[PDB]
Structure 1
Amino acid sequence: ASSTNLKDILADLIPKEQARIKTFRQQHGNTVVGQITVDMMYGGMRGMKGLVYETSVLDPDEGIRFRGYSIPECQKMLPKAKGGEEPLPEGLFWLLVTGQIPTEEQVSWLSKEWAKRAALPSHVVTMLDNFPTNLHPMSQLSAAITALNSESNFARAYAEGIHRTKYWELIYEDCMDLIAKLPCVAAKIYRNLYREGSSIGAIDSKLDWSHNFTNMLGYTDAQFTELMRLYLTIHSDHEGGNVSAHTSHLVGSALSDPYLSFAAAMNGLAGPLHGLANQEVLVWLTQLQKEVGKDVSDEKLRDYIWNTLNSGRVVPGYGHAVLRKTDPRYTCQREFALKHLPHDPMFKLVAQLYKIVPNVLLEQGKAKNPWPNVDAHSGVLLQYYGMTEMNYYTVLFGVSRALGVLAQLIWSRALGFPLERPKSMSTDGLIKLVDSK
């Protein structure tokens, strides 16, 4: 079929993957991987191996891996814009879908595809323009994505009857269309809330996805576009157990189309326990710089931190239960800042905390692995380029996370994963059960 066509490459991979899972399940489907306890059921399935998600896996020693590749390896190998040095999100998506590193010519193809499919129907433009400024940007995003399901071709084809084995084909189309549209929707929200409802302008079919997005947002700094490339790539996926991904997976399994699956996933991302870490850190940093001042000594910063731990408070963005070192997504952003904004005062604070915090967390003993995550670094970077509207920052996370959750959604359907339908129990039934047990 095609070297550069993603869909031809996918069609060739899928049957070989079906056959490999079938023979694995034939010898080991009955193999016990864990026990369920009462505490796990009350505890939000904490520590329960419950689903198969193919695109990304956490390595406790190396950080999140994308189809086997660590972040450093991705930065190295994935194609960059011309004149750029940050990896294009297009190439990340290719890798997640195929397991393979795309050539420059495959990535260039994918940029064009996304530009060609980027169109919004008039009812969605009209809806966005009529929303009030007190409707949160993530609610605006989800509702507009729900309203685009009028454009789903899977929804249409399923109603006309199609064979199970062919679902993935139209799923693939709808996912490609949704990704293409996302930056248009997100930029209309940004401009309507924060730039007096000015026009997002036109798509340029020779640019990459991120560049079209930053144009439509109204930004002109070439290095902001480089930041956006990096940012969208590194927030793209993080296993399937997080609420945004699991929500897409669960709604997807009912054969709701990608529009509906993704909007549902954005409603979970909007939750304060999933979507707000970047903002929480930036607010704390802001408070901190006010308290201690602009050229604080290492000693005086260390005191502040100790005073804070010995007050039952925590340092946001620091500490993990599993990963044994600094998140490499934190390190990526560090290096960017060292090249492009090393003299910024809020970055200097973020760098100074990186020097000092980890050791203070050890003196306290408590926190197991006292290293920072991706959210400890992202706000100060956005802020520097003038993207200061913190309520909006979860929208960017969402546009990124689409790449991961939709790449998986194609494979959930290719492999014929069934409806997700665990069994619930009430407190009374558990009590009855452990007494008969």
Structure 2
Amino acid sequence: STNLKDILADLIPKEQARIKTFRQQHGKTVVGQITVDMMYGGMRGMKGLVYETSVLDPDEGIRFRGFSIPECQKLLPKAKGGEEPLPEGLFWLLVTGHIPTEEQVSWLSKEWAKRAALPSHVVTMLDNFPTNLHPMSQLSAAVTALNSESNFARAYAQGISRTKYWELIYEDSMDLIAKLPCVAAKIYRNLYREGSGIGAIDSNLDWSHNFTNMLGYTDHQFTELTRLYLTIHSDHEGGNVSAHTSHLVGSALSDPYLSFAAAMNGLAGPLHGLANQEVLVWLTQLQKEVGKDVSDEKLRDYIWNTLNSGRVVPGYGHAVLRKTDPRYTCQREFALKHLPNDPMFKLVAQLYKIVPNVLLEQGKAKNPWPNVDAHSGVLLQYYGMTEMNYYTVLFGVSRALGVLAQLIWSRALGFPLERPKSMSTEGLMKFVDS
């Protein structure tokens, strides 16, 4: 009823049988071609993997189990006295494919509060970490060290049946998610608050409220933003570096902790998790080379010169998207509500007007419209979250929801080891010549 585990237990056999049938019939159906260019181009356009939780039509944006961001904003349960969707309900949707009732989201909130205790070696390790070790390295090192708690690793060693793998994965995942705000808040304070304590988990609050409590924020609006941020960053298909990494590491039957740890090292890379910071630093240098309240034409020039300099306009474009990312739109709406008269936000909203006009004239874009990262950093800066390095930790906490939801299903459906074939250049050349 409210026990996610029994609900999942009921869904899984339906889904096994539905895939078994599908593979019997259409297993040998060709869905795409592989070229030389795709092999050297990082599997671009290559249909690589099955990923159930979410799907990104390049035209209309991410869909969580068929539901768009707007639909989730409406249907997903909210906090009492709040407007933004709770991450809890997102997670439930990703795991069950069903919109949760208020009671199930409350149940889940209690489960995650109850599983939030950190083992002392992990506390100790975060507290001894130096201030020059980046937040994302700290997050990953600590999640890896939490695998001491892994049910799944201990059970695998003792020869547990394949049919039961997903149960241990689920427990481990519920444990990880529950703990992530503690880990992340402990990093936040140790770096940016002279190592002050994270305080206590309130058993009756939602995941995002305990998190902001542990971060030291009391602004109700920052808690609403967090709930909106953690929902919308939760998943973005299987092919993004962090989801693919966790999928790949998961398939060797590495436990959730190690799987997720690997995903964060993926997310720590510039071309994945840093665009947020890359946009903010530019917006700051923009308002420091053109000044505030500038002119739409003065702006049009800055954009032109930037592209003539051969530099990118950060936050505009996507690997696969070809339109305004709904996660951008999502954030704009929240800005229009709670901080419409913010210098930086007006600038962002100004750049929405100009930037999609160039790039398409430049001819080089395909996607001239903005992505999520164009809009996230000014919301975070607005509420006093100014430490840019830390931003990707927030992304990572969010992305746990997506990839762990899917990891449960990957194990439920017995997905095997990911292991493609590679070729050398010299080997490719001989192969094409035959």
- Extract unaligned runs of 5+ from structure 1: none
Runs of 4+ with deviation above 6 angstroms:
none
Query: How big is the shift at 1:365?
Result: 3.5
Deviations 1:375-396 (A, max 9, x none): 0000000000010111111100
Counterparts of 1:405 and 1:65, CA distance in 2: 14
Change (3 A) 1:271 1:323: closer
Aligned to 1:228: 226
- Extract unaligned runs of 5+ from structure 2: none
Instruction: Select 2:158's aligned residue among 157, 160, 164.
Output: 160
Deviates more, 1:40-49 or 1:69-78: 40-49
Residues 29-40 of structure 1 aligned to structure 2 (within 5 Å):
29-40=27-38
Deviations 1:334-354 (A, max 9, x none): 010111011111011001111
Answer yes or no: is the 8 Å Cα contact 1:321–1:368 preserved in 2: no
Deviates more, 1:79-88 or 1:348-357: 348-357
1:377 equivalenced with 2:361 (yes/no)? no
SS where residue 34 of structure 1 aligns?
Answer: strand
Counterparts of 1:15 and 1:96, CA distance in 2: 17
Instruction: Select 2:414's aligned residue among 404, 413, 416.
Output: 416
Change (3 A) 1:130 1:59: same
Counterparts of 1:309 and 1:39, CA distance in 2: 26
Counterparts of 1:172 and 1:8, CA distance in 2: 11
Deviations 1:54-80 (A, max 9, x none): 111112232110000111101010011
SS where residue 272 of structure 2 aligns?
Answer: coil
Query: How big is the shift at 1:310?
Result: 2.8
Answer yes or no: is the 8 Å Cα contact 1:55–1:404 preserved in 2: yes
Aligned pair count reads: 434
Query: How big is the shift at 1:180?
Result: 0.1
SS where residue 51 of structure 1 aligns?
Answer: strand
Compute the RMSD of aligned alpha carbons.
1.1
Deviates more, 1:121-130 or 1:29-38: 29-38
Deviations 1:123-149 (A, max 9, x none): 100111001101111111101001010
Query: How big is the shift at 1:323?
Result: 3.1
Counterparts of 1:46 and 1:61, CA distance in 2: 17
Residues 195-210 of structure 1 aligned to structure 2 (within 5 Å):
195-210=193-208
SS where residue 362 of structure 1 aligns?
Answer: coil
Counterparts of 2:389 and 2:317, CA distance in 1: 24
Counterparts of 1:202 and 1:427, CA distance in 2: 56
Percent pairwise identity: 96
Deviations 1:61-104 (A, max 9, x none): 32110000111101010011000000000000000000000000
Change (3 A) 1:369 1:118: same
Deviates more, 1:250-259 or 1:353-362: 353-362
Deviates more, 1:148-157 or 1:290-299: 290-299
Deviations 1:96-120 (A, max 9, x none): 0000000000100000000000000
Counterparts of 2:363 and 2:43, CA distance in 1: 28
Deviates more, 1:379-388 or 1:348-357: 348-357
Query: How big is the shift at 1:425?
Result: 1.7
Query: How big is the shift at 1:321?
Result: 5.6
Query: How big is the shift at 1:311?
Result: 2.8
Deviates more, 1:301-310 or 1:54-63: 301-310
Query: How big is the shift at 1:325?
Result: 2.4
Counterparts of 1:248 and 1:22, CA distance in 2: 24
Change (3 A) 1:305 1:392: same
Counterparts of 1:366 and 1:222, CA distance in 2: 42
Answer yes or no: is the 8 Å Cα contact 1:114–1:177 preserved in 2: yes
Q: TM-score, normalised by structure 2?
A: 0.98
